[PDB]
Amino acid sequence: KMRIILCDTNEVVTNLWQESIPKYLCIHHGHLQSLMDSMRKGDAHSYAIVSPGNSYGYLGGGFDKALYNYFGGKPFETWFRNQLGGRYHTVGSATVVDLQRCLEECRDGIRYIIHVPTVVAPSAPIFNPQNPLKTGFEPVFNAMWNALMHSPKDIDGLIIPGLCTGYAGVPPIISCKSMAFALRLYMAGDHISKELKNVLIMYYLQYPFEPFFPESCKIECQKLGIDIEMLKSFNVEKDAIELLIPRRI
Amino acid sequence: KMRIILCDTNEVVTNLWQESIPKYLCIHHGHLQSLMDSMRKGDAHSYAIVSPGNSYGYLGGGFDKALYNYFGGKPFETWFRNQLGGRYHTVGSATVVDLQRCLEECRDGIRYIIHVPTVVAPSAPIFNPQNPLKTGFEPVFNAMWNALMHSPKDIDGLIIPGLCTGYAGVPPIISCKSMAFALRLYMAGDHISKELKNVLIMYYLQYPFEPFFPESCKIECQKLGIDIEMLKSFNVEKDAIELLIPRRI
Ligand SMILES: Nc1ncnc2c1ncn2[C@@H]1O[C@H](COP(=O)(O)OP(=O)(O)O)[C@@H](O)[C@H]1O
Ligand SMILES: Nc1ncnc2c1ncn2[C@@H]1O[C@H](COP(=O)(O)OP(=O)(O)O)[C@@H](O)[C@H]1O
Ligand SMILES: [Cl-]
Ligand SMILES: [Cl-]
Ligand code: NA
Ligand code: NA
Ligand code: NA
Ligand code: NA
Questions:
Q1: What's the gap in Å between the CA of B50 and the closest CA on chain A?
Q2: Which residues form the domain of B188?
Q3: Strand stretches in chain B, DSSP E
Q4: A31 among known catalytic residues
Q5: Cα B75 from chain centroid (whole Å)
Q6: Are B25 and B3 in contact, with CB atoms under 8 Å apart?
Q7: Residue A95 belongs to domain with CATH number
Q8: Which residues does UniProt assign to the signal peptide (chains A, B)?
Q9: Best mutation site among B68, B77, B89, B120 for testing chain A: the one with the most A CBs within 10 Å?
Q10: Which atom of ligand 2 is nearest to the CA of B119?
């Protein structure tokens, strides 16, 4: 029902998205502005856009800079930061800013900005090749999951750029995989129980804790064609997400 | 106005708390149950208790086990997890569960449980001595900050145990320092602007990004007696938090 639009200027990110994502989803290789421009030929809708930002709400670089220029510049940023409460927001959290209040600076059909802090500050990248899981796969999954979970149920579409693939420094090959997995779970809709999706996330992130894998979910894996053994040994570095969520689902 | 009660069975944690925290704050060395017992001699109040849990809401170990036994066991946990929405909650987020709904399992004077995921699952510790900042100081600060920020404004007191100092594996010496810093900011009340507190957090976490340090905050540092140079080189491993928030404030 909700159209997901992945947008990025980096070809590496868009190509990987195409290669890993099975209408309800669109991929735009280019600037946010070019997407918004062509977004006026089909309408003659309400959207939310994901902001991979910092813990303080400043919109001075990367994707956020696009938003900065598009919505009003400095005065907008000042307004934006105050909507966020003006204080430190932790990475792993998400806050929705409703632009509807633009009626005392409105723009296009975007009513919401889903602010997801991906870095405390852009003083350095978050990624460390020594642990691509803790500084790559996990943080990216968390940002995508939070973006999807916080998306207002009333919007027509959701605009999302590569997460942590810019100033955060996470390789596209890692980020795109976590983004794809989060999307695949979302796309599965109610075809997979909330609890089983929990388990898939737990093993995808490599936290094999049996106590959190109920028998009912094992029964569900059997019914859905999800190999429990491959699940229990899932290696995000080498295994295809198709093993956790078979395309048939 | 709000009484903060730090509670833990580990003497190392309580001693460090005493040594690092300047009535409005109480420290209980012992089990949560012993605290709740003695919490009946002064009343003849509404509280919130912080749960350093997992991303799935299970209450099977550590402090959470105390809550599990105290509030009703398995049936309570089942109810609790559903109040949390029944799905994966990211580390770096916090969700408040209102026990008031216990009137169709109520207990003492605790009305809220502030659930703060400190681990995805207790399959292993989050701490890594190779980077005590990314896996220790930062996650602990984030949990304390989220606990304080999400504490309902209507409660009389807030019960908080050591964060990430159990199954998470963070050394008490690291966790207690981040807990103390978060408390010191909270205790400073309006004596320090929201923006300056942001900057102190930014440097405490070691993200020296000048663009996020406004001139107005520098002026404030000067007025408050906060050495801007020591601030800009703050080393959470060696520097005292008293340098960021002078006790005079
Ligand atoms: N104007 C833009 N339009 C579309 N995509 C952009 C634009 N600017 C940056 N991006 C892309 O957005 C992604 C994330 O960027 P960034 O803002 O730096 O966030 P993060 O700090 O999480 O990495 C990158 O893949 C980058 O190529
Ligand atoms: N019953 C209890 N009463 C008071 N403190 C407790 C109790 N059980 C555990 N703790 C303390 O709570 C802290 C955090 O415990 P834990 O639940 O394992 O969370 P985390 O996974 O974040 O480390 C530890 O310092 C531990 O000693
Ligand atoms: Cl743009
Ligand atoms: Cl106890
Ligand atoms: Na960012
Ligand atoms: Na950005
Ligand atoms: Na925990
Ligand atoms: Na616990």
A1: 17
A2: 1-249
A3: 3-8, 25-29, 47-54, 95-98, 110-119, 157-160
A4: no
A5: 27
A6: yes
A7: 3.40.220.10
A8: none
A9: B120
A10: 21
